[PDB]
Amino acid sequence: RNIVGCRIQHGWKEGNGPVTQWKGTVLDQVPVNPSLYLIKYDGFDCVYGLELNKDERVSALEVLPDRVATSDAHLADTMIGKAVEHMFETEDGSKDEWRGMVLARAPVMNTWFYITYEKDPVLYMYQLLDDYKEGDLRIMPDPGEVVDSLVGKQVEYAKEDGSKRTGMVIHQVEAKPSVYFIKFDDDFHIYVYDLVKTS
């Protein structure tokens, strides 16, 4: 009944539409909020944050058998912490190069890497060693340690309504200790923030 590391499947009810089946791998259970799971779903590149046993859109949650197994560490270790250019191919067959940063080796799914993008600051997961060999990934050349860890603090901001909403600092990056993951209560994406000295 510990589901970290397990493949899972469940119904997902988007709005009032019919229940659809979802399949994914549970990467982690958030220490500062153990009802919060990070999930890598097949088909979504983005890591999801869900209270799997509390969220009302989730139904019939079951543990599945593990995925059929398969069989370079220096390349992966030099990639981590680094800024990168990641080349995606537009419908035109042309190339759009998103600048981003590689944050860590993903848990449970070791071939996979946590990555985030300047044009999209949420937490993605990709198998970057393939994209590097293919040439589609270039590694660019190269406060969070002064300040004590913010992990577990509950964040608070205002919307343009003046309505205040909350979130939670769930993780500090081991490779770049000024980078933090925030999961807001009203979204399932994991947003990446940098701790900056003011002015």
């Binding site: 940063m101 985030t116 993008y117 300047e118 044009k119 999209d120 600051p121 406060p143 300040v147 004590d148 913010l150 603090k153 509950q154 964040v155 608070e156 901001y157 909350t166 979130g167 980078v179 933090y180 925030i182 807001f184 009203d186 979204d187 994406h189 947003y191 990446v192 923030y193 940098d194 701790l195 900056v196 000295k197 003011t198």
Partner: peptide
């Protein structure tokens, strides 16, 4: 959903002084 571009308030008011959390996109 639109994530705040900057965060500098905690509910217990303990956000460290002189710093801000900036969305990775700024």
């Amino acid at each position: 959903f639109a994530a705040p571009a900057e965060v500098r308030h905690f509910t217990d008011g303990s956000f460290p002084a002189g710093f801000v959390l900036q969305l990775f996109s700024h």
